[PDB]
Subunit: 261 residues, 2 copies
């Protein structure tokens, strides 16, 4: 398990098309999970799952645009649920769950597609891992440093202190990351002023992005999003903070770093 998860992912950031393939895979998984909490029903799950997985490809390769395939994946989904679900108050339930999967999971995750394209495969790996880096440092400095509850009563506990730490761990992960990456080739990287914010957002977003998921799970009755990968936890669980991050990161990058060819 754990020996390949880290490098398999990374080795994917090589091609734009490789990136797509990873995002696609992750979406079938994460998507399957979030949809399965609303459907234990045979076909239902699968169709909407396929939709959730198609976006990266349609967005990146088919249309060189995002909004166009987003609208039709939604439209195709609702059409389907109208055909299949004949109880109207229920057609609403599947569309609601599919609606969250589409925005939260699918739309938000495929934000790597433009982050990669417009900011170099480099910063892509940077954003992704900076969440892993924040995550560790948030845990450690959280256990031994305080009880200031920012997390809700239903969500797994989180501290202001744990975040201020994970913040710093990202702040540092970048000095290190900068040097190593401007070296290995003349590679594009997060400049020095786009540092403090990029940390701040990986901080604040992963926090909110996980709390939102935990709330999402208390509604479906579980403490795990689902079991797809034999690894520890669920696929949606290993992603949750990353979802809120990517979008906010891409915004932060454009505001503070311009563009590429």
């Amino acid at each position: 398990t754990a020996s390949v998860v880290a490098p398999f992912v990374v080795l994917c950031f090589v091609s734009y098309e490789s990136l797509i393939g990873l995002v696609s895979a992750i979406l079938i998984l994460a998507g399957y999970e979030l949809i399965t909490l609303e459907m234990k029903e045979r076909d239902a799950r699968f169709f909407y799952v396929i939709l959730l997985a198609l976006y990266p490809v349609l967005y990146g390769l088919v249309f060189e645009e995002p909004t166009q395939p987003l609208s039709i994946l939604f439209i195709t989904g609702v059409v389907f649920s109208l055909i299949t679900d004949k109880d109207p108050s229920q057609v609403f339930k599947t569309v609601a769950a599919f609606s969250i999967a589409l925005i939260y999971v699918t739309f938000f995750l495929s934000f790597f597609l433009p982050i990669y394209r417009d900011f170099g495969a480099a910063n892509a790996l940077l954003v992704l891992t900076s969440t892993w880096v924040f995550d560790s440092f948030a845990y450690f400095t959280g256990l031994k440093f305080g009880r200031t509850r920012i997390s809700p009563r239903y969500s797994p506990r989180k501290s202001l202190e744990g975040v201020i730490g994970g913040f710093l761990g990202v702040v540092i992960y970048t000095f290190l990351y900068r040097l190593v990456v401007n070296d290995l080739l003349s590679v594009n990287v997060i400049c020095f002023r786009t540092f403090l914010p990029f940390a701040a957002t990986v901080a604040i977003m992963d926090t909110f992005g996980d709390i939102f998921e935990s709330a999402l799970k208390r509604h479906y009755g579980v403490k795990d999003s689902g079991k797809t990968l034999p690894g520890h936890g669920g696929m949606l669980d290993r992603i949750d903070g990353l979802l809120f991050v990517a979008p906010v990161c891409y915004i932060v990058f454009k505001i503070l770093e311009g563009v590429v060819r």
Copy 2:
């Protein structure tokens, strides 16, 4: 009680709207307005709660501006309007199984209503204020012709049992009424100025989508209302029906139309 309250609104609705397609910024302001209304309605079915409604309402109304003026991009503000919304519901709603209910309703509002309707923003920009008005009215045009040729030309049920009556026949008619509305629309508009219009091959499809989309777009809304228990989305405008009700098929149309235009007409700026 006067006959000037029901007629004055019937006289301005049509031209007020049209007179807006003049500026890109005017278009934005109409779309913004319509979203606060339509949005207020769809959210209100899930919330009879004081603040809740209003916050998410404002979010749903902001997208057109943020998308058109602030970011010259769509996806960026879409993601943050959602994120700002969920953050809010986490703060306010403390029951997790309920935070899910408001996010679900807000989620449909965002995509269906807000995202779909503001598609006029790019349709206008990339296809000329002309075709914008063309798409919008072509739904009004399809709507009439679908009603008439529907009453007297058939009873083959395409519409669901909870949904207002619809027939394959009524659509094949509204299809044609749009097909024709364009010959007419083309001539008048290539005349009044050297104006950009739906070419002749982009005709058959544009009809087909206004047909098929308004159909699905209304059925989805009707299903949406059966869940909330009403036969009207809400009463905002004193006019007949609700604001969301006058738009429902238009939502599914705009997106699909924009796609269809790009596939078939390039960037006729």
